[PDB]
Amino acid sequence: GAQVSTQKTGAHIHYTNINYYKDAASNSANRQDFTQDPGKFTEPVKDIMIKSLPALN
Amino acid sequence: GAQVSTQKTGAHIHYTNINYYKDAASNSANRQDFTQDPGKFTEPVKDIMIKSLPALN
Amino acid sequence: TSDEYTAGGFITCWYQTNIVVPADAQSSCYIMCFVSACNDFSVRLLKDTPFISQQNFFQ
Amino acid sequence: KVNSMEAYQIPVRSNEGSGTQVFGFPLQPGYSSVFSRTLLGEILNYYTHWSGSIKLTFM
Amino acid sequence: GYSDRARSITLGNSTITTQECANVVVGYGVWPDYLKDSEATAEDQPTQPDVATCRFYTLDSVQWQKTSPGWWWKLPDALSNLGLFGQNMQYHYLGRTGYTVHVQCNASKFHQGCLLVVCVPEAEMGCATLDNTPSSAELLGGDSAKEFADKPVASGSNKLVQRVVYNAGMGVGVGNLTIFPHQWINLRTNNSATIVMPYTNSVPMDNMFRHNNVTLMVIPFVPLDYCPGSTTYVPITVTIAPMCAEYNGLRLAGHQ
Amino acid sequence: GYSDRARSITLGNSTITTQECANVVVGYGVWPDYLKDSEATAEDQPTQPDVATCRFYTLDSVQWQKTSPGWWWKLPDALSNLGLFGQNMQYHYLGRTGYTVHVQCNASKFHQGCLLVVCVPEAEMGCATLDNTPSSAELLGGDSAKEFADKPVASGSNKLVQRVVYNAGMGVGVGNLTIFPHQWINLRTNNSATIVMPYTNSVPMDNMFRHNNVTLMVIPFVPLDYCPGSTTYVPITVTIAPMCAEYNGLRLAGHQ
Amino acid sequence: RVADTVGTGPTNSEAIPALTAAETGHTSQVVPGDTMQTRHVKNYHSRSESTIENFLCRSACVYFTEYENSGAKRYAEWVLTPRQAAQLRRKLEFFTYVRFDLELTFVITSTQQPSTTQNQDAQILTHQIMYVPPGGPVPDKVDSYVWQTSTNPSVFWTEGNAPPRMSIPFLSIGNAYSNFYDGWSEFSRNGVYGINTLNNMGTLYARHVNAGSTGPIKSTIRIYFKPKHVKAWIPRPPRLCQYEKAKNVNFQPSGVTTTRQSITTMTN
Amino acid sequence: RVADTVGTGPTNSEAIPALTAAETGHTSQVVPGDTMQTRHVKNYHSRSESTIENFLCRSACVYFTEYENSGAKRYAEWVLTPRQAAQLRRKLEFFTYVRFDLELTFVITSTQQPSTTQNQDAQILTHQIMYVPPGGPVPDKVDSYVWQTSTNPSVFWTEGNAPPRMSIPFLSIGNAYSNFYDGWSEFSRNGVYGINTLNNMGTLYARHVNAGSTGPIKSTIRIYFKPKHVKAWIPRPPRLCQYEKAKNVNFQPSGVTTTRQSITTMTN
Numbered sequence A, B: 001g002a003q004v005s006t007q008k009t010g011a012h013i014h015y016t017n018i019n020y021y022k023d024a025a026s027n028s029a030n031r032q033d034f035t036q037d038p039g040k041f042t043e044p045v046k047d048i049m050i051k052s053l054p055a056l057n
Numbered sequence C: 001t002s003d004e005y006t007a008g009g010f011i012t013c014w015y016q017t018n019i020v021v022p023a024d025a026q027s028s029c030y031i032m033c034f035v036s037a038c039n040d041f042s043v044r045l046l047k048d049t050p051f052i053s054q055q056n057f058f059q
Numbered sequence D: 001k002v003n004s005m006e007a008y009q010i011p012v013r014s015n016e017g018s019g020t021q022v023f024g025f026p027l028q029p030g031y032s033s034v035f036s037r038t039l040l041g042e043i044l045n046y047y048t049h050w051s052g053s054i055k056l057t058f059m
Numbered sequence E, F: 001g002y003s004d005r006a007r008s009i010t011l012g013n014s015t016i017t018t019q020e021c022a023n024v025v026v027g028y029g030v031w032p033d034y035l036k037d038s039e040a041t042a043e044d045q046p047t048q049p050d051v052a053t054c055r056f057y058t059l060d061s062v063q064w065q066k067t068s069p070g071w072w073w074k075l076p077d078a079l080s081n082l083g084l085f086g087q088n089m090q091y092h093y094l095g096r097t098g099y100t101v102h103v104q105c106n107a108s109k110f111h112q113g114c115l116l117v118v119c120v121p122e123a124e125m126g127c128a129t130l131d132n133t134p135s136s137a138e139l140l141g142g143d144s145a146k147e148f149a150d151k152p153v154a155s156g157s158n159k160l161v162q163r164v165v166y167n168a169g170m171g172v173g174v175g176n177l178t179i180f181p182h183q184w185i186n187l188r189t190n191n192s193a194t195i196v197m198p199y200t201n202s203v204p205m206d207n208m209f210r211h212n213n214v215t216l217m218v219i220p221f222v223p224l225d226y227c228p229g230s231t232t233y234v235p236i237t238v239t240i241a242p243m244c245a246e247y248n249g250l251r252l253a254g255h256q
Numbered sequence G, H: 001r002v003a004d005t006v007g008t009g010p011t012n013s014e015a016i017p018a019l020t021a022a023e024t025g026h027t028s029q030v031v032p033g034d035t036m037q038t039r040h041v042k043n044y045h046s047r048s049e050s051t052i053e054n055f056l057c058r059s060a061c062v063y064f065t066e067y068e069n070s071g072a073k074r075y076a077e078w079v080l081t082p083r084q085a086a087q088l089r090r091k092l093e094f095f096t097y098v099r100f101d102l103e104l105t106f107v108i109t110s111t112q113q114p115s116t117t118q119n120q121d122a123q124i125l126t127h128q129i130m131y132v133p134p135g136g137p138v139p140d141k142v143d144s145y146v147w148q149t150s151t152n153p154s155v156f157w158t159e160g161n162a163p164p165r166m167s168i169p170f171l172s173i174g175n176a177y178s179n180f181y182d183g184w185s186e187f188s189r190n191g192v193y194g195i196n197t198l199n200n201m202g203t204l205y206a207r208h209v210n211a212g213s214t215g216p217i218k219s220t221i222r223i224y225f226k227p228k229h230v231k232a233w234i235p236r237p238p239r240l241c242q243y244e245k246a247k248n249v250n251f252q253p254s255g256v257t258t259t260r261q262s263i264t265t266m267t268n
């Protein structure tokens, strides 16, 4: 049950991986998880703030 | 003749295994056999005892 | 093991009314206690028991 | 009392009063001397963590 | 199968078990519920503590002797200092609740006696001096029970309650107290007595400090007796559970 | 209708009646049966005596005193000299059987006490001298019961069993003996105790003289007590019934 | 996965889940929602570490012994028996009968002994371990013919690499390994009493194939058992007392448990 | 992949992207094409090295300790705690709560000690490392029975090959490892204050299985942690000050930053 995924290559190829142990805590690190959501910290306000609008009106 | 099974992972991924020797006594331990039946010991009586009922009637 | 961060509580027993007996009967009785676990009970982290011990190999 | 069958007996007699205590111990199923040597306690010692509800039956 | 003698009552984190009991008495046919919208008066939103207030509170025990006139308890005052029920009734202005009273007395097969257990609504009591009205320390004793007398209380210039028993303090005939919800504890048959009284009043809610809606009276119509050699100390225990308790009018703590 | 207290057991030409008994304990959930063909090893044809061997044999009675540590019986040895069961086990080489043990003790409503009845499989016992192993006259006494001790047995150069009771002779904690099939005789509730143990072993059959499969232990966790004027002699009786007994390997009579 | 609590409410009924009768030898199956009000909880805990295979399948040292490259003690012998180490013995004795495969691992380590011999320049040491089943010949000396291992299983190991390890199948003439035996070897009800009667497991021998050096060297071998594919029957209570010998169940009487100050004290 | 700049032109409007109000606790989301004219740029840069898994999944030395083959210090013990090394501690304390698997690697290295003993010819050394979870027995001496590891995890390693390495799962009675704890152990609000309250991780012991030589040898063990499958919550500011102890957050007051000459100076 091999898993084929894509390699980290430049911009402007695949690799194969097999799990050998029955404990999921032995697998390799989850390196490719490029998901970001800065909205919890940068803009935590109750009311939406349009950029091109007076913050206080 | 590879055997693909599920890994032990948390709640709230698979692994592959192949047997290399012809003696079944060389295989890995049978770790995932979560089957329990406490009725042989906790309630070994001849007559059934309903929980919400007087044990002696 | 003993850990304050995970303290359990206290179990106590009290007299509600009294033990009442007639004449020619013993006013002193005994109670017995049995402990067991329910369906939700679980255990983790297998370790060695601090009860058994040995100084030299038995023969 | 640990060197007899009296360790398992909880004495309860007729009391000329009311609301006094019979016994008490902490909910430490594997560390307290009351519980560390019972089947539950014995099995608990081989592990580090426990979870679930407990049954105490009195006869 | 099951029997009518055995009965368990669960409320909050409290369970009451009995193996020799008579049928439960439910008030005037009514089960305690909550105040509806077509019957309310106070406009703000009430708070229902539920499990924290609707549970079994046990009181002190009293000893049943061969010469005990009887005891009584003003129900709302009795629990005014127990757990979160007392605190909620101390921080609020109006309250509403029904009750579940369980009275317990156990004895052997060689003891005899009979106790009347009656929940009397609005048991207004009289004073020994016709001139004045009785004190609050005489009428309601919290954290304890109030005892009746076998002889009439003397008159004078005081504020004592007329605790004569055959008059029930209310100036009536005691044998008629079976017009109210009641239960008999007969030592040869009964063991305990349960009464489930709903909220009785002439207003939808009431202040719980200056008014006592009901009263628990325990009187031994037939005296206690036994023969030399049997147990001589026989106590009586009372456990009260509030039901559908709600509170309205949050204010500062106190009763003045 | 019928009650759960009354229960009759018929085996062979023997009937046991009881009017105050707890539910029967059936082994580890298994009812004693015969050896099947897919599980047998010995090739010849076995003999099943049925009614002549599967019936109730009563043993001697022991007296329950206010200071009795307890008793035990090696089940196979106990009946090795009774009726045709003993004869069949004396003329054959291999045998197989389950049991039905009924322990009886009756007393009045003014007596108190509690006895633990436990069928212990493979109860290997220890010696008082660490150097040697106990004698067969110390371990198994036929036609009689073996008594426990309240104090530890002294050491030396003998072959005595360590009959201390709170250690059960097996060097364990006695309160854990409720892991095996068991039953309590409580004088205020119980009257007798029935246990239906099947054949437990690691081989399909076994010689019945040099190996004891199970053992009956009777221990009074709560002592016997009464007040002056009531009966002072209280005996305990044990009745064992073999079930599905079969024998294989006919030979000359003897055990050497 | 453990059971999930069911939410309950207030009750006033003739049902009696709390009241039972313990004289029937039956454990009460009462859940917490029978004596109080509860909430619905979604339990996700697993009973995956309480399994007998997980509880027993871990390597344990059951014995270790020494031999030398010169002098008198030139080889080591050990009748196979796990009842010498307390830990694994107490784990197995939880049950009356067991049945498992075995995984053997050997940790062989040498040490140089103090002496006055000079110009010592040792070559790598090779060890031989040999198993003799009951009935076969035994090595009376170190350079005897029995070490030819024509049929006897044996392992040659050169110091410096991975420890030797093998798999043993369930070897028993019976249907299960008996942890306890209440009986004798002879039909005359005398002789050997107890589980020593069923201990017919063979013997393990160990030696140096070469001497290596001109100076003294002592090699210690540690044996490790690891049960696999475990089956178990008829659970027993734990030992409580301390073990004394390897062949019998003898003990010294000990108190039920440790004490406290009163029946109301919440402290050890 | 980072966002791509949008090309803009000259504007004359009542829109005010630059003017904002910072009292609302909100960061302005202004792009450069709001205050100037820009060109269209196709950005190809990736944020693949700023991920918490990439930032934290690297092995770090958290401790090292010594033991000997003779004399007094015959074994080594260490209550597991990462707050002894500054680097990994400061990396983790970026967040309030974390949750990760662990990858342990051990670098064991021996050295010969100065002495006057002669004719030294050492055999290969084997080491044992043993983990005791909180509650189990401890090795009072070097040749005690606890080293049988019947249930306790342990690793046997012979000097000369690949370093030993294992995987540890997220071991916590809670839902996350707390890097900071603002409270006490006792309900009486006295006693142990701080994160030492939640440090119930077990103990690690290490020894030589054989002595190897007749002369003295000291072995040092270095422990390396490597978080895997990391989750983190509630980011905090960096330490700034220098650490003092391993059990608390005590510090010595330090200036906000380093200085310069004036408010107009372009030099450190």
Ligand SMILES: CCCCCCCCCCCCCCCC(=O)O
Pocket (backbone or CB within 6 Å): G080, G082, G092, G098, G102, G104, G129, G130, G131, G153, G154, G155, G166, G168, G171, G177, G178, G179, G201, G202
């Ligand atoms: C080259 C070395 C080979 C070694 C082979 C060893 C085979 C014998 C294994 C003995 C296992 C004993 C298990 C006892 C179990 C029990 O009764 O509790």
Ligand SMILES: CCCCCCCCCCCCCCCC(=O)O
Pocket (backbone or CB within 6 Å): H080, H082, H092, H098, H102, H104, H129, H130, H131, H153, H154, H155, H166, H168, H171, H177, H178, H179, H201, H202
């Ligand atoms: C044979 C050696 C086995 C070693 C097993 C070690 C298991 C314990 C690991 C401890 C991890 C501690 C993580 C702390 C994280 C934190 O709170 O910041």
